[PDB]
Structure 1
Amino acid sequence: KNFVISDPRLPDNPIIFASDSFLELTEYSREEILGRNCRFLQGPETDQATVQKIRDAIRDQREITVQLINYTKSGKKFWNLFHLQPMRDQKGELQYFIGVQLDGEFIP
């Protein structure tokens, strides 16, 4: 339900699609999201060490799961259990990343 799709073939891996649940959770309108990198959800309290692990996963085009603090439009802190999956065409060329979010502090 709660997910976005980025196009890594376009500059800085912009969000091309965002699910209604995502717009609801993050409090942003679709118009504010389309063409942005998803890093705008990060903020002061976001562990940079965890952000680095996401950068490595995108570089190596591997799937990853991490928990990190994210901010809504209004600046409300929420824990994001974030799941990144690379997505390839028939020829095995990377086409998209899908990013699934789950809201809550799962690991204390």
Structure 2
Amino acid sequence: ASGMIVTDAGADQPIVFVNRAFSTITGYAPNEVLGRNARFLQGPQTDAATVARLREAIAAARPIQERILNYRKDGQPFWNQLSISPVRDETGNVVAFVGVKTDV
């Protein structure tokens, strides 16, 4: 199943919701991740240029897809086919971001 992360739009995009699949994939319970930026999923071999593209896309509220190296709670690396999109209201204001870890 595909994991889903929802964050606030502003400040440092703290996580406000993760689905059940997220916990299966990552080994983290909601209470371990809520109120944190999702960058804690990254680790020593995560590609800097990929992180830079995510950073610029989120800052511009542009949808982006990247395959990024993440780490489970237990430290085991996994490939995250990650897609991030802004959630906008009808005035164009960004209300949230949604991230999907696609089950390929």
Q: If the length of structure 1 is used for normalisation, what is the TM-score?
A: 0.90
Q: How many residues align?
A: 103
Q: CA RMSD in A?
A: 1.2
Query: Which ranges in structure 1 are unaligned for 5 or more consecutive residues?
Result: none
Offset, 1:90: 2.0
Counterpart in the other structure of 1:26: 26
Counterpart in the other structure of 2:63: 63
Distance 2:34 2:92 in 1: 26
Q: Which runs of 4+ in 1 moved over 4 A?
A: none
Q: Given residue 81 of structure 2, which amino acid in structure 1 is its aligned partner?
A: L
Distance 2:102 2:51 in 1: 17
Distance 2:12 2:65 in 1: 21
Q: If the length of structure 2 is used for normalisation, what is the TM-score?
A: 0.94
Which SS does the other structure have where 1:54 is aligned?
Answer: helix
Counterpart in the other structure of 1:7: 8
Alignment CA distance shift 1:103-1:41 (3 Å): farther
Distance 2:81 2:60 in 1: 20
Query: Which ranges in structure 2 are unaligned for 5 or more consecutive residues?
Result: none
Superposed CA offset, 1:69-95 (max 9, x none): 100000000011100111111221010
Q: Given residue 13 of structure 2, which amino acid in structure 1 is its aligned partner?
A: N
Given that 1:78 and 1:103 are in contact with CA atoms closer than 8 Å, whether structure 2 keeps it comes out as: no
Indicate whether 1:39 and 2:24 are aligned.
Answer: no
Which SS does the other structure have where 1:40 is aligned?
Answer: helix
Q: Given residue 95 of structure 1, which amino acid in structure 2 is its aligned partner?
A: V
Structure with the bigger RCO (C-alpha within 8 Å, sep 6+) is 2
